[PDB]
Each structure stands twice: as C-alpha cells, then as structure tokens.
C-alpha cells in the first residue's frame, strides 16, 4: 500500500536504492519537532499514505516519544528502525499504534 520511508541520517544513505502499492523514499538531516510535524502534515496530504518507516542517526530518545504521540493522534502505524527512534521505551499505549524493533 501507500508507505512512506523517511530516514534521518548523517551516514550517506542515498535514495535511488530505496492491488495498490506505492513507496515513498526521502532523506532528512534535521531532527527538530516542528520539522517532524510539518513533514508529517505535508505528506499526509500526499495521496493517503498509510505506512511510515522511520530511522534516526542521532541518539535522542524524544524522537520516538513524539513519533508515538503523533501516531496516536493520527491513528497511523509507525516503526522504529535506528537511533533514538528505535530505542525501546517504557510502556506503550493501546490508543497508540507505534511499534519498534
């Protein structure tokens, strides 16, 4: 289905290697909350994307907290792949649909 793959990395990971399935590939550097909210709200108007795969290069664990909160407030599943966003948190909430590794 419509899945968005967003990566916040400093390591050089390019984008070209990345019934109705569509995939979104992007590369991001900054990790401030306003940027996250703006990007999420912009892509949410982009053809009804249901899938969100995210990873981070920094080691800040509040990114996963904000991702879980936004997933709950949008009812959209989100994954954690790398960095502070993939760090295992304390206690998820049934209202939330955020999942990690």
């Amino acid at each position, epitope marked *: 289905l419509n899945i968005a793959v967003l990566l916040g990395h400093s390591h050089d990971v390019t984008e070209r290697e990345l*019934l109705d399935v*569509n995939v979104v590939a992007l590369l991001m550097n900054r990790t401030d909350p306003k940027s996250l909210i703006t990007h999420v709200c912009d892509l949410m108007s982009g053809a009804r994307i249901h899938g969100l795969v995210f990873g981070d290069d920094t080691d800040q664990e509040a990114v996963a907290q904000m991702l879980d909160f936004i997933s709950s407030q949008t009812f959209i599943p989100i994954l954690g792949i790398h960095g502070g966003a993939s760090m295992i948190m304390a206690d998820k909430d049934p209202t939330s649909t955020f999942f990690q590794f």
Partner: antibody
Amino acid sequence: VQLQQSGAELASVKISCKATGYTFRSYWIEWLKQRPGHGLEWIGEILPGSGRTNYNEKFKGKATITADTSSNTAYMQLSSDSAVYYCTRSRGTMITREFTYWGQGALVTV
Amino acid sequence: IVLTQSPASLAVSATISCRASEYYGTTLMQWYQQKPGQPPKLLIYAASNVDSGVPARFSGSGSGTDFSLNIHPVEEDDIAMYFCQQSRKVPSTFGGGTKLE
C-alpha cells in the same frame, strides 16, 4: 464494469448509482457537476467498505453522499443548481487518480 | 490551485499550453480528451508518460508551473476539447477548455 443511474428530475432530490461489474466494497465513488458553459467541478468521494466521507468546501453543507452495501447503490442528496451529474470510479492502480468509468447522467432543473 | 490555459479556441489546418499557479521529482498533470457527448478519456499522466493503447503521435513535456502539449502529425482525431488537471493538493481542478478546427 458498467454503471447505471436514475432518471431526470424537475425542494430536494436523490440520485442512485448502482455497480454491477466488480466488488462494490473496495473502490471509492466520486460525484461530478458539469453545468454547461464550463469544464467541470468536484463534489466528494465515498468508500462503501468503511463509510469514510470527504466533501468539498464549496459544496460543503449542501450535498450529502450515502451508500448502501446491500444493493450496491450510491445516494447523493442536495438540499434547498441545474446541472448534469456524473458518478465515476477510478481504475484502482492509484496515484494517477484519473476517471475512466462514466455514468449516464441525470439532468436536474428548477 | 487555479489553472488557466490559452487560447480558448485554436485554428489549425498545433500546440497547447497550460500554466499553473511537482512532488519530489514527479510532475502532477493530466490531459483529457472529451469528444462531444462522451465521457473524458485520459491521455497523458505524470506530464511525461503516455498511456498504453494510444497512438504514438502524442507527446508532452513540462515542469514547474509551465507545461505544454503538442501533437504531430495532425489527423481527424484531435477535434475535441482538452484540459489539464492538477493533483498536488486536494481537491483537484481542471482547465478551461480548448476547441480545435
């Protein structure tokens, strides 16, 4: 896939749009206005599978769209405008969001 | 998004223009052919890729907010109205129409 609609009209009205070529619970249904003198417009879409509905700001509060999962029909109600109407369905491959299957057309007049 | 195209009427024995008021390297513009008394038919998608099952005489190009359409050679088929549609933001909007003779 073929589409059928109601007849002409001449207050409030209701127009039916019946599906007899596919699984009616999978694809969205969109309504179009084609008043003569210009190209076209866009009203709203409805998904019979779950019932999620979105409406256009210009036509908000004036057009109500409903569907029946049993008879596979689409109902659009305009309350309290003389134009030709169309109900259509996309191909399903998505992204492009184009219109391929077209109805017959119901001519309403006041 | 508001679209505007000229000329409203064209006299040939040709080309078309549609200027807008992109999505990560993808252009969102489609051209429809509508004979009198018939439903519209999609002709070009992504502003650069033609539709399968259509004559090769049609080709298009454009980027940003200025896109154009041209046809060669000229035959009896291109005798209807045409328009351009955007999909970068919901709801979509179409053109103003363009005859041919």
